[PDB]
Amino acid sequence: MSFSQAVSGLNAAATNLDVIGNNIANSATYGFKSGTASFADMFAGSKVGLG
Amino acid sequence: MSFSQAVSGLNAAATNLDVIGNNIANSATYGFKSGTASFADMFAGSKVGLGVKVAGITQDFTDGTTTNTGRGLDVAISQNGFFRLVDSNGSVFYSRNGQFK
Amino acid sequence: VKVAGITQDFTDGTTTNTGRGLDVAISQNGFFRLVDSNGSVFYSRNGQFK
Amino acid sequence: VKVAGITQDFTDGTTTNTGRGLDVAISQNGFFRLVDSNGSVFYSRNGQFK
Amino acid sequence: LINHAMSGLNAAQAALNTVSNNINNYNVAGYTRQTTILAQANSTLGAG
Amino acid sequence: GKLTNGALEASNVDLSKELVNMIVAQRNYQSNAQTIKTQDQILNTLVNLR
Amino acid sequence: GATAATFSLSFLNSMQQNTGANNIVATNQNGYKPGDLVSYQINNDGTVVGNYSNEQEQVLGQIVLANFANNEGLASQGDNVWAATQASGVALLGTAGSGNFGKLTNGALEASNVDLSKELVNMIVAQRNYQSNAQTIKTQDQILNTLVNLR
Amino acid sequence: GKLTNGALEASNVDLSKELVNMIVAQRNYQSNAQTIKTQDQILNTLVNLR
Amino acid sequence: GKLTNGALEASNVDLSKELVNMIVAQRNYQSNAQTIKTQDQILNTLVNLR
Amino acid sequence: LDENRNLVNMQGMQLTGYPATGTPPTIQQGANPAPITIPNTLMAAKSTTTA
């Protein structure tokens, strides 16, 4: 628990925002494909133990 | 960066708008051919890199409505083919516009 | 920044006809010479004389 | 920080039309030569002249 | 955008004035038809 | 190509396609700018938040 | 300074009907001069073809399509460059229309299959998650500095 | 040049130039306003921090 | 380079460019202010020690 | 098209494909995907042998 949880979740959200922004950036690039990030549970006792 | 992704894209879009504005500005320039620019994705390192990188221009070579004007010095080449021009530098240039004097 | 300048164009008259026997304007460059109550010599292209 | 420098960029702006017979601007590459009030040869990229 | 469109505004003003003189002077004896010419670009004359 | 005389070659620019491209470019720029805005305002929120 | 040819000529399927009809219809001589080129075209199969002044045709080109297993492994390395790797399997090859292979188009282009509005709803969601995590980071900071404050 | 009688000549003030100049220079007005505001934000940040 | 006559060259500036520079400067000064404030509270902790 | 008439993406990346072989050229279906270069040259001088 503690800092790691919130920092990791913060950066997870920001990560998916990264691919969203890159999709926006290449929204005109022909044949370009829409991307998304894969997420997983930081299991440590708690299923959100470190976020 | 997500932010960079957007910024790069915004910047590129500014370039696209510039070329579009020039397209309109030329919308009656005799013999003129229309233009557009080409984008690329600035993936680097991993993930998305930084955004989009942009270096490319597209020009079409279809022949517009070849209009008739009657001057004995008005010429146009249908389909490929171009006129040769020169300046005081001894240069050689090619052009499609064919109004002469 | 600081700003310092006043400069003007001198292309010719947007031309208009009136037929009044005192409207005078100069085609091509050149200006008029006028004198005030004190005789002060001033220059103008306005052609509305009376 | 450790940085100490000036920079001025030679990149071009838009070419604009006025018609003044003393408005002169530089395409691409170059710089203007002038003599100041003292004989020093001074230099500018501005194109407004009288 | 802005510079090119506004330059085109001036160019159109010129062309319209030309045709307006033409239609005006359609009945001036010995008048000769007037026409205007224009020029912009290919691969750009702006060096970046 | 064959030569035509007493004629001239028009602009192959289509005004309609350029108008639609103009508005779509508005949308592209607006998407980029508003993504910038949302990220910037919420980031400044975080940069302030500490 | 050249070389010349020779041919055999025959007239299959001709018929002489005892009543009234008379005409020739068949077109076959296989020779032509080395034609000059004005054309080149690309079709819905990936081929590239050209035709020449001798009103005859020449072809050299086929574009290869490939099937992959873990397609995400074909990651873009910039300039839409797939990095084709084991992490995606391999490129199992076939030309457009090879049964298990789609169709091609030329003089055309495929959209960026993104949509801006969808991306903005997703952005709303993600930025709100980011807000939550930010506030929680500061919450933990506050609690831990409170524990430091007690002393 | 030469003189005309019963005619007048009008100014060079074309609305197309001047209104677009007003538009761009008002863009600059708001640009410097945005700069001013952000400088105020800078000081207000530094003021409130201590 | 070849010269322009009766013409002027704009500055190599863009409003969007300068607003981007403004955003990055906002981030820079906010970063410097936060970097101060943290070590500044640590210093005030030191002032409580010495 | 690149200056040598090779088919390329804008980065100059060379369109790999199967070439035709023989005369009349016929596509090699088992082959190294390689840049197709558009002929700068006239075709075969295939004279007559049958009619």
Author numbering:
A (entry chain z): 1 to 51
B (entry chain 1): 1 to 101
C (entry chain 3), D (entry chain 2): 52 to 101
E (entry chain C): 4 to 51
F (entry chain 1), H (entry chain 3), I (entry chain 2): 354 to 403
G (entry chain z): 253 to 403
J (entry chain z): 102 to 152
Paper text:
The flagellum is the most prominent extracellular structure in bacteria, with a molecular weight in the hundreds of megadaltons. Structurally, the flagellum can be divided into three major components: basal body, hook and filament. A ring-like structure formed by the proteins FlgK and FlgL, termed the hook–filament junction (HFJ), forms the connection between the flexible hook and the rigid filament. To assemble a filament, flagellin monomers are secreted through the flagellar basal body and hook, and polymerize at the distal end.
